[PDB]
Protein backbone atom coordinates (compact mmCIF):
# COMPACT_ATOMS: atom_id res chain seq x y z
CA UNK A 1 0.00 0.00 0.00
CA UNK A 2 1.10 3.70 -0.64
CA UNK A 3 2.71 5.62 2.06
CA UNK A 4 0.55 8.18 3.76
CA UNK A 5 0.54 12.18 2.32
CA UNK A 6 -1.35 15.09 1.77
CA UNK A 7 -1.08 17.69 -1.30
CA UNK A 8 -0.31 14.49 -3.28
CA UNK A 9 -2.53 14.37 -7.03
CA UNK A 10 -4.27 11.89 -7.92
CA UNK A 11 -6.45 10.97 -11.47
CA UNK A 12 -8.50 8.48 -13.00
CA UNK A 13 -10.05 7.16 -16.25
CA UNK A 14 -12.97 5.93 -13.77
CA UNK A 15 -11.15 2.42 -13.38
CA UNK A 16 -7.51 2.87 -11.85
CA UNK A 17 -6.57 6.12 -10.22
CA UNK A 18 -3.02 7.36 -10.66
CA UNK A 19 -1.69 8.89 -7.92
CA UNK A 20 1.43 10.94 -7.60
CA UNK A 21 3.97 13.30 -5.30
CA UNK A 22 2.52 15.11 -2.06
CA UNK A 23 4.31 15.02 1.36
CA UNK A 24 4.54 13.38 4.95
CA UNK A 25 5.74 14.19 8.10
CA UNK A 26 9.72 15.11 3.46
CA UNK A 27 8.50 14.72 -0.12
CA UNK A 28 7.08 11.20 -1.48
CA UNK A 29 9.46 9.86 -4.52
CA UNK A 30 9.30 11.93 -7.59
CA UNK A 31 9.89 8.49 -10.00
CA UNK A 32 7.34 6.58 -8.02
CA UNK A 33 3.18 6.47 -9.27
CA UNK A 34 0.77 4.44 -7.50
CA UNK A 35 -2.20 3.12 -9.33
CA UNK A 36 -5.19 1.80 -7.71
CA UNK A 37 -7.60 -0.62 -8.92
CA UNK A 38 -10.90 1.00 -8.06
CA UNK A 39 -12.90 -2.39 -8.97
CA UNK A 40 -10.60 -4.95 -6.66
CA UNK A 41 -9.20 -2.56 -4.26
CA UNK A 42 -5.56 -3.16 -5.08
CA UNK A 43 -2.47 -0.89 -5.39
CA UNK A 44 0.45 -1.41 -7.99
CA UNK A 45 3.67 0.79 -7.83
CA UNK A 46 5.50 1.75 -10.73
CA UNK A 47 8.54 3.66 -11.03
CA UNK A 48 8.52 5.91 -14.09
CA UNK A 49 11.33 7.90 -16.22
CA UNK A 50 12.08 10.73 -18.85
CA UNK A 51 11.53 14.32 -17.07
CA UNK A 52 10.28 13.24 -14.16
CA UNK A 53 8.63 16.39 -11.89
CA UNK A 54 10.79 17.53 -8.92
CA UNK A 55 8.53 16.01 -5.57
CA UNK A 56 5.65 18.16 -4.87
CA UNK A 57 2.85 19.26 -2.81
CA UNK A 58 -0.31 21.16 -4.50
CA UNK A 59 0.04 20.48 -7.53
CA UNK A 60 -2.22 20.52 -10.19
CA UNK A 61 -3.33 17.57 -12.65
CA UNK A 62 -5.76 15.69 -14.83
CA UNK A 63 -6.31 12.57 -16.74
CA UNK A 64 -7.72 12.24 -20.81
CA UNK A 65 -7.96 9.51 -22.46
CA UNK A 66 -5.36 7.88 -20.02
CA UNK A 67 -2.88 11.26 -20.34
CA UNK A 68 -2.26 12.48 -17.57
CA UNK A 69 -1.25 16.08 -17.52
CA UNK A 70 0.59 17.97 -14.99
CA UNK A 71 0.61 21.87 -14.41
CA UNK A 72 2.39 23.67 -11.01
CA UNK A 73 2.88 22.56 -7.71
CA UNK A 74 5.71 23.30 -4.85
CA UNK A 75 8.96 21.53 -4.19
CA UNK A 76 12.10 21.80 -2.36
CA UNK A 77 12.77 25.43 -3.86
CA UNK A 78 9.39 27.07 -4.40
CA UNK A 79 6.45 27.28 -6.89
CA UNK A 80 6.92 26.45 -10.37
CA UNK A 81 4.83 26.71 -13.41
CA UNK A 82 6.19 23.44 -15.86
CA UNK A 83 3.85 21.54 -17.42
CA UNK A 84 4.67 17.53 -17.84
CA UNK A 85 1.95 14.90 -19.27
CA UNK A 86 2.54 11.12 -18.96
CA UNK A 87 0.89 8.63 -21.12
CA UNK A 88 -0.29 5.97 -19.19
CA UNK A 89 -1.82 3.77 -22.22
CA UNK A 90 6.60 -0.82 -20.87
CA UNK A 91 8.02 1.65 -18.30
CA UNK A 92 6.14 5.23 -18.52
CA UNK A 93 8.30 8.12 -19.62
CA UNK A 94 7.60 11.84 -18.25
CA UNK A 95 7.37 14.50 -20.88
CA UNK A 96 8.02 18.27 -19.79
CA UNK A 97 6.28 20.62 -22.34
CA UNK A 98 7.84 23.55 -23.44
CA UNK A 99 4.97 25.71 -23.94
CA UNK A 100 4.23 28.24 -26.08
CA UNK A 101 2.39 31.77 -24.95
CA UNK A 102 2.44 33.38 -21.58
CA UNK A 103 2.29 31.06 -19.00
CA UNK A 104 0.33 31.13 -15.62
CA UNK A 105 2.74 32.42 -12.56
CA UNK A 106 4.28 29.73 -10.48
CA UNK A 107 1.68 28.06 -8.05
CA UNK A 108 0.21 25.77 -6.86
CA UNK A 109 -3.05 24.75 -5.05
CA UNK A 110 -5.47 25.59 -7.85
CA UNK A 111 -8.17 24.03 -9.77
CA UNK A 112 -8.54 22.70 -13.76
CA UNK A 113 -11.57 22.33 -15.69
CA UNK A 114 -11.38 19.91 -18.90
CA UNK A 115 -13.83 20.87 -22.15
CA UNK A 116 -12.91 19.84 -25.11
CA UNK A 117 -9.13 20.50 -26.38
CA UNK A 118 -8.43 22.79 -23.43
CA UNK A 119 -7.02 23.04 -20.39
CA UNK A 120 -8.65 25.55 -18.37
CA UNK A 121 -6.72 26.81 -14.89
CA UNK A 122 -7.81 28.91 -12.24
CA UNK A 123 -6.98 30.65 -8.85
CA UNK A 124 -3.48 29.37 -7.18
CA UNK A 125 -1.15 30.71 -4.41
CA UNK A 126 2.89 31.65 -5.97
CA UNK A 127 4.61 34.32 -6.75
CA UNK A 128 3.79 38.38 -8.24
CA UNK A 129 3.08 37.51 -11.95
CA UNK A 130 1.58 41.59 -16.82
CA UNK A 131 -1.27 38.69 -17.07
CA UNK A 132 -5.51 39.11 -17.38
CA UNK A 133 -6.87 39.14 -13.63
CA UNK A 134 -5.72 40.08 -9.87
CA UNK A 135 -3.29 38.75 -7.59
CA UNK A 136 -3.31 39.93 -3.86
CA UNK A 137 -0.32 39.45 -2.12
CA UNK A 138 -0.50 37.44 1.08
CA UNK A 139 0.94 39.86 3.79
CA UNK A 140 2.25 36.97 6.14
CA UNK A 141 4.68 35.72 3.15
CA UNK A 142 7.07 39.01 4.08
CA UNK A 143 8.14 38.50 7.24
CA UNK A 144 9.61 35.27 -1.60
CA UNK A 145 6.66 36.62 -0.93
CA UNK A 146 3.24 35.40 -2.58
CA UNK A 147 -0.02 35.63 -2.88
CA UNK A 148 -3.67 34.62 -4.21
CA UNK A 149 -4.96 35.12 -8.18
CA UNK A 150 -7.96 34.62 -10.07
CA UNK A 151 -6.40 33.92 -13.32
CA UNK A 152 -8.29 31.91 -15.87
CA UNK A 153 -5.52 30.02 -18.43
CA UNK A 154 -5.88 28.28 -21.26
CA UNK A 155 -3.24 25.34 -22.37
CA UNK A 156 -4.61 24.25 -25.72
CA UNK A 157 -3.56 20.88 -26.01
CA UNK A 158 -3.93 20.90 -30.04
CA UNK A 159 -0.74 23.03 -30.05
CA UNK A 160 0.61 23.53 -25.85
CA UNK A 161 -0.14 27.27 -26.41
CA UNK A 162 -0.89 29.44 -22.74
CA UNK A 163 -3.62 32.06 -23.74
CA UNK A 164 -6.17 33.88 -21.26
CA UNK A 165 -9.68 34.56 -22.04
CA UNK A 166 -11.40 38.02 -21.81
CA UNK A 167 -14.60 36.93 -19.15
CA UNK A 168 -17.41 38.97 -18.49
CA UNK A 169 -19.48 38.66 -14.89
CA UNK A 170 -18.23 38.77 -11.69
CA UNK A 171 -15.24 36.23 -11.27
CA UNK A 172 -15.10 34.55 -7.84
CA UNK A 173 -11.97 36.63 -5.69
CA UNK A 174 -8.39 35.74 -5.95
CA UNK A 175 -8.24 32.25 -3.89
CA UNK A 176 -6.24 28.89 -3.14
CA UNK A 177 -7.44 25.48 -1.95
CA UNK A 178 -10.95 25.50 -3.56
CA UNK A 179 -12.00 22.85 -5.77
CA UNK A 180 -12.97 22.51 -9.15
CA UNK A 181 -15.84 20.15 -11.38
CA UNK A 182 -16.67 20.46 -14.70
CA UNK A 183 -19.82 18.90 -16.42
CA UNK A 184 -21.03 19.85 -19.63
CA UNK A 185 -19.67 23.82 -20.28
CA UNK A 186 -19.50 24.65 -16.65
CA UNK A 187 -16.61 24.94 -14.80
CA UNK A 188 -18.10 25.07 -11.03
CA UNK A 189 -15.43 26.26 -8.25
CA UNK A 190 -16.12 25.99 -4.69
CA UNK A 191 -14.83 27.72 -1.71
CA UNK A 192 -11.11 27.76 -0.86
CA UNK A 193 -8.54 30.07 1.19
CA UNK A 194 -8.38 34.01 0.36
CA UNK A 195 -6.90 36.69 3.13
CA UNK A 196 -7.85 35.54 6.08
CA UNK A 197 -11.48 33.71 5.04
CA UNK A 198 -12.19 30.02 4.23
CA UNK A 199 -14.92 30.91 1.73
CA UNK A 200 -18.69 29.13 1.28
CA UNK A 201 -19.97 30.50 -2.68
CA UNK A 202 -19.98 28.42 -5.39
CA UNK A 203 -19.69 29.80 -8.83
CA UNK A 204 -19.63 28.35 -12.76
CA UNK A 205 -17.62 29.93 -15.72
CA UNK A 206 -19.46 29.36 -18.71
CA UNK A 207 -17.00 27.29 -20.96
CA UNK A 208 -18.23 28.32 -24.62
CA UNK A 209 -18.99 32.28 -23.59
CA UNK A 210 -16.03 32.74 -20.92
CA UNK A 211 -18.99 34.01 -18.82
CA UNK A 212 -18.79 33.81 -14.88
CA UNK A 213 -21.98 32.88 -12.90
CA UNK A 214 -22.43 32.89 -9.12
CA UNK A 215 -24.97 30.38 -7.67
CA UNK A 216 -27.25 31.19 -4.71
CA UNK A 217 -28.58 27.68 -3.65
CA UNK A 218 -31.97 28.07 -1.64
CA UNK A 219 -31.93 26.56 1.56
CA UNK A 220 -29.38 24.97 3.97
CA UNK A 221 -25.66 25.95 2.25
CA UNK A 222 -21.92 23.94 3.48
CA UNK A 223 -20.06 26.10 6.00
CA UNK A 224 -16.96 27.90 4.20
CA UNK A 225 -13.96 25.63 3.64
CA UNK A 226 -10.49 24.92 1.81
CA UNK A 227 -8.81 21.80 0.62
CA UNK A 228 -12.00 19.96 0.17
CA UNK A 229 -12.71 18.21 -2.90
CA UNK A 230 -15.50 19.17 -5.36
CA UNK A 231 -16.02 15.54 -7.98
CA UNK A 232 -18.87 15.19 -10.64
CA UNK A 233 -20.72 12.27 -10.30
CA UNK A 234 -23.48 12.08 -12.67
CA UNK A 235 -24.22 14.85 -15.91
CA UNK A 236 -26.49 16.29 -12.62
CA UNK A 237 -24.41 16.17 -9.51
CA UNK A 238 -21.00 17.21 -7.27
CA UNK A 239 -19.93 15.69 -4.89
CA UNK A 240 -18.10 17.95 -1.72
CA UNK A 241 -16.13 16.19 0.65
CA UNK A 242 -14.32 17.28 4.02
CA UNK A 243 -12.12 20.16 4.09
CA UNK A 244 -11.09 23.12 6.84
CA UNK A 245 -13.31 26.00 7.93
CA UNK A 246 -12.03 29.95 8.71
CA UNK A 247 -11.85 28.48 12.64
CA UNK A 248 -9.49 25.91 11.77
CA UNK A 249 -11.79 22.43 11.93
CA UNK A 250 -10.97 19.75 10.24
CA UNK A 251 -14.40 18.99 8.26
CA UNK A 252 -16.09 15.33 7.71
CA UNK A 253 -19.54 16.46 5.73
CA UNK A 254 -20.18 15.21 2.53
CA UNK A 255 -22.65 17.02 0.05
CA UNK A 256 -24.31 16.39 -3.21
CA UNK A 257 -24.88 19.82 -5.07
CA UNK A 258 -27.79 19.08 -7.65
CA UNK A 259 -26.99 21.12 -10.84
CA UNK A 260 -30.48 21.29 -12.28
CA UNK A 261 -32.16 21.81 -9.04
CA UNK A 262 -29.46 24.14 -7.95
CA UNK A 263 -29.68 22.68 -3.95
CA UNK A 264 -27.40 21.10 -1.72
CA UNK A 265 -28.08 17.68 0.02
CA UNK A 266 -26.12 16.56 2.79
CA UNK A 267 -24.98 12.94 2.47
CA UNK A 268 -24.60 10.18 5.19
CA UNK A 269 -21.86 7.85 4.90
CA UNK A 270 -19.63 6.12 7.70
CA UNK A 271 -17.03 8.28 8.11
CA UNK A 272 -18.14 10.99 10.34
CA UNK A 273 -15.13 10.27 12.52
CA UNK A 274 -12.73 10.67 9.20
CA UNK A 275 -12.33 14.53 8.57
CA UNK A 276 -10.02 15.02 5.90
CA UNK A 277 -8.31 18.10 3.91
CA UNK A 278 -5.93 17.88 1.05
CA UNK A 279 -7.02 14.44 0.14
CA UNK A 280 -7.80 14.03 -3.15
CA UNK A 281 -11.26 12.60 -4.75
CA UNK A 282 -11.98 10.35 -8.14
CA UNK A 283 -15.37 8.96 -9.40
CA UNK A 284 -15.47 5.64 -10.66
CA UNK A 285 -17.61 4.56 -13.61
CA UNK A 286 -20.18 2.59 -10.93
CA UNK A 287 -20.95 6.23 -9.59
CA UNK A 288 -18.69 6.00 -6.44
CA UNK A 289 -16.45 8.61 -4.91
CA UNK A 290 -12.81 7.10 -4.00
CA UNK A 291 -11.08 9.45 -1.44
CA UNK A 292 -7.51 8.96 -0.91
CA UNK A 293 -4.98 10.67 1.69
CA UNK A 294 -5.09 13.85 3.40
CA UNK A 295 -5.00 15.58 6.67
CA UNK A 296 -7.14 13.91 9.60
CA UNK A 297 -6.29 17.24 11.57
CA UNK A 298 -4.82 20.67 10.92
CA UNK A 299 -1.63 19.98 9.19
CA UNK A 300 -0.53 24.06 9.81
CA UNK A 301 0.67 22.24 13.18
CA UNK A 302 2.82 19.59 11.01
CA UNK A 303 4.96 18.34 14.26
CA UNK A 304 1.23 16.69 15.28
CA UNK A 305 -0.18 16.83 11.62
CA UNK A 306 -1.98 12.65 11.15
CA UNK A 307 -1.60 12.02 7.60
CA UNK A 308 -3.46 8.99 5.98
CA UNK A 309 -3.30 6.59 3.48
CA UNK A 310 -6.85 5.43 4.19
CA UNK A 311 -9.06 4.88 0.47
CA UNK A 312 -12.46 6.12 1.81
CA UNK A 313 -15.72 5.13 -0.41
CA UNK A 314 -18.71 7.10 -1.17
CA UNK A 315 -21.50 5.33 -2.67
CA UNK A 316 -23.09 8.39 -4.24
O1 LIG B 1 -4.81 28.21 4.45
C1 LIG B 1 -5.33 27.55 3.50
O2 LIG B 1 -6.54 27.21 3.44
C2 LIG B 1 -4.41 27.17 2.35
C3 LIG B 1 -3.82 28.37 1.65
C4 LIG B 1 -2.73 29.15 2.10
C5 LIG B 1 -2.60 30.17 1.26
O3 LIG B 1 -3.55 30.10 0.29
C6 LIG B 1 -4.28 28.99 0.55
Given at each position: ?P?????????????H??????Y?????P???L?????????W???????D??????????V???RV????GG???????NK???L?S??????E?????????????K????????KL?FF?????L??????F?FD?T??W??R???????I?????????Q??????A??????????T??????????????????????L?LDT??????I??G???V??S??S???????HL??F???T?????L??A????I?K????????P????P?????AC??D????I????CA????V????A????????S?
Amino acid sequence: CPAERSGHVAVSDGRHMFVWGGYKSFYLPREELWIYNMETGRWKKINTEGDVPPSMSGSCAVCVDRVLYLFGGHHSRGNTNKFYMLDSRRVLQWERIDCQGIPPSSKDKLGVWVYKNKLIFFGGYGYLPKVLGTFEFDETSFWHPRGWNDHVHILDTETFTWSQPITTGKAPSPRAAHACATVGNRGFVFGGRYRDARMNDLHYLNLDTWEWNELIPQGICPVGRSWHSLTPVSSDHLFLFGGFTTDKQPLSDAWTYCISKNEWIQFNHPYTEKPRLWHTACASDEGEVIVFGGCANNLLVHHRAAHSNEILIFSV
